[PDB]
Amino acid sequence: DVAFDESFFSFGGHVGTSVEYEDKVTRGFNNTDKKEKTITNEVFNFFYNNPQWNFMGFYSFKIENREQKEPGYYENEDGIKQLFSLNKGHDLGNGWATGLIYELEYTRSKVYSPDVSGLRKNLAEHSIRPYLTYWNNDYNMGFYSNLEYLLSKEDRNAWGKRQEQGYSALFKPYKRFGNWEVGVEFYYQIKTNDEKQPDGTINEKSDFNERYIEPIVQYSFDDAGTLYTRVRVGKNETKNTDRSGGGNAGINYFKDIRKATVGYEQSIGESWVAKAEYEYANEVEKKSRLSGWEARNKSELTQHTFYAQALYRF
Numbered sequence: 622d623v624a625f626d627e628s629f630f631s632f633g634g635h636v637g638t639s640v641e642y643e644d645k646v647t648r649g650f651n652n653t654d655k656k657e658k659t660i661t662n663e664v665f666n667f668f669y670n671n672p673q674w675n676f677m678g679f680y681s682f683k684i685e686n687r688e689q690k691e692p693g694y695y696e697n698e699d700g701i702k703q704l705f706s707l708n709k710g711h712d713l714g715n716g717w718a719t720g721l722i723y724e725l726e727y728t729r730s731k732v733y734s735p736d737v738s739g740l741r742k743n744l745a746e747h748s749i750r751p752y753l754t755y756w757n758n759d760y761n762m763g764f765y766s767n768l769e770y771l772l773s774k775e776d777r778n779a780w781g782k783r784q785e786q787g788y789s790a791l792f793k794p795y796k797r798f799g800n801w802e803v804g805v806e807f808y809y810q811i812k813t814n815d816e817k818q819p820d821g822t823i824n825e826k827s828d829f830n831e832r833y834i835e836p837i838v839q840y841s842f843d844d845a846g847t848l849y850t851r852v853r854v855g856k857n858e859t860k861n862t863d864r865s866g867g868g869n870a871g872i873n874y875f876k877d878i879r880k881a882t883v884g885y886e887q888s889i890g891e892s893w894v895a896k897a898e899y900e901y902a903n904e905v906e907k908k909s910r911l912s913g914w915e916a917r918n919k920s921e922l923t924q925h926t927f928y929a930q931a932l933y934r935f
Contacts, residue, residue: 623673623674624674627671627673627674629671629674631671631673632669632670632671633670633672633934633935634667634668634669634670634934634935635666635667635668635894635932635933635934635935636665636666636667636668636932636933636935637663637666637667637668637930637931637932637933638663638664638665638666638930638931638932639661639663639666639928639929639930639931640660640661640662640663640928640929641659641660641661641663641926641927641928641929642658642659642660642661642926642927642928643657643658643659643660643661643924643925643926644657644658644924644925644926645657645658645659645922645923645924645925646922646923646924647920647921647922647923648919648920648921649920650908650911650915650916650917650918650919650920651914651915651916651917652916652917653691653692654691655689655690655691656689656690656691657687657688657689657690658687658688659685659686659687659688660685660686660687661683661684661685661686661702662683662684662685663681663682663683663684663930664682664683664684665680665681665682666679666680666681666682666932667679667680667681668932674709675709675710675711675712675720676707676708676709676710677707677708677709677710678705678706678707678708679704679705679706679707679708680703680704680705680706681702681703681704681705682701682703683701683702683703683704684701685698685699685700685701685702685728685730686698686699687699694734694735695734695735696732696733696734697732697733697734698730698731698732698733698742699730699731699733700728700729700730700731700742701728701729701730702726702727702728703726703727703728704724704725704726704727705724705725705727706722706723706724706725707722707723707724708720708721708722709721716755716756716757716758716763717753717754717755718753718754718755719751719752719753719754720751720752721749721750721751721752722748722749722750722751722752722767723747723748723749723750724747724748724749724750725745725746725747725748726744726745726746726748727743727744727745727746728742728743728744729741729742729743730742730743730744737779740777740778740779740780741777741778742775742776742777742778742780743775743776744773744774744775744776745773745774745775746771746772746773746774747770747771747772747773748769748770748771749769749770750767750768750769750770751767751768752765752766752767752768753766753767754766760796761796761797761798762794762795762796762797763794763795764792764793764794764795765791765792765793765795766790766791766792766793767790767791768788768789768790769788769789769790769791769810770787770788771785771786771787771788771789771810771812772784772785772786773785773786778819779819780818781816781817781818781819781820781822781824782816782817782819783814783815783816783817783824783825784814784815784816785812785813785814785815785829786812786813787810787811787812787813787829788810788811788812789808789809789810789811790808790809790810791806791807791808792806792807793805793806793807795837800840800841800842800843801838801839801840801841802837802838802839802840802841803836803837803838803839804836804837805834805835805836805837806833806834806835806836806837806853807833807834808831808832808833808834808835808855809830809831809832810829810830810831810832810857811828811829811830812828812829812830813826813827813828813829814826814827814828814829814859822866823864823865823866824865824866824867825861825865825866825867825869826861826862826864826865827859827860827861827862827865827869828859828860828862829857829858829859829860830857830858831855831856831857831858832855832856832857833853833854833855833856833878834853834854834855835851835852835853835854835855835880836851836852837849837850837851838850838851845887846885846886846887846888847885847886847887848883848884848885849882849883849884849885849886850881850882850883850884851880851881851882852880852881852882853878853879853880853881853882854878854879855877855878855879855880856875856876856877856878857875857876857878858873858874858875858876859873859874859876860873860874861873861874868912871910872908872909872910873908873909874906874907874908874909875906875907875908875909876904876905876906876907877904877905877906878902878903878904879902879903879904880900880901880902880903881900881901882898882899882900882901883898883899884896884897884898884899885897885898891934892933892934892935893931893932893933893934894931894932894933894934895929895930895931896928896929896930896931897927897928897929897930898926898927898928898929899925899926899927899928900924900925900926900928901924901925901926902922902923902924902926903921903922903923903924904921904922904924905919905920905921905922906919906920906921906922907919907920
C-alpha cells in the first residue's frame, strides 16, 4: 500500500562534493620505496532518502588520479570510480530494525608506464549486506550489525583477470552519554582470491581472512561541531595454495594493521554540512618463507589520507 500512498518522488537527502588526498609509501621486501599519491575528486554525490518507504539510495561520481614511483619505474593511473547503493529497511518494533543493502562500486581506468600506454582496467565490486540494528531509548545504547557477501571482478585485459569472493560480519555496540558517543567495531572477513593471465596461467590462488577491532569516541559541542576519533587494530592472513604462481605457491602472508582517524563535522545554517577527516595507517607484512631474492622479511606501508567534504541537505 505504501508505494501507492506515498510517492517515490517525496524524498529528502543531499547533494555533495568532496576531495581526498592520499600519500602512501611502501618499503617492500627488497628494502626499497614504492611511493604513491592519489587524488580523488568527487565531483558529485547524491543521497536519496524516502522515510515513508524506509528506502534510501546513493550515487557517487569520482575522478581518480594516481601516480606511482619506484626505483627505475613509474606508473600513472587515471580513471573514474562510481558508486551506486540501495538500502531498504524494515522496522521490527521495540527498538529493533533490519534491512538489506546492495552496493556496486565500479571503476574504469587507464594505466601508463614504461611498458604500457593506456592499458584499460575495470573493477566491479558487488556488496550485499543484510543488517540488524537495536537501540534502547532508556539506556541510550544499542548496536549495529551486518553480514556481507562481496564479489570483486577485475578485468585488466593484457594483464589478465582477478576475482575475489567472500563474506564478512560486523558487530558494533555503542552508547551515548550527554554529548558523547562511544562504540567499538568488531569485524571479520573471509575471502578467496583468484588471479590469472589471459594465457590461463595462474598468478594467485589464495585464501584470506582479516579481523579488526576499532573503538570510536565522539564528542558533539552544543555550540559547534562533532569531533571524533577512531583507532583500529587489525591483522590479516593470505594463504597461497600449491597452485599459486609467481613463486608464491604455498607461501603465507601475515599483516599487522594499525590505524588512527580524526575527523570533524559541522552543520552550517539550515542546509550545508562540512566535514574533514585525517587517517594515518601503518601496516607491516611478513612471509612464511622467503624465496631467495628478497632483501628482508618485511614490507611496510605508511599512509596519510586527508578528506574534505561539503554537502547541501534538502
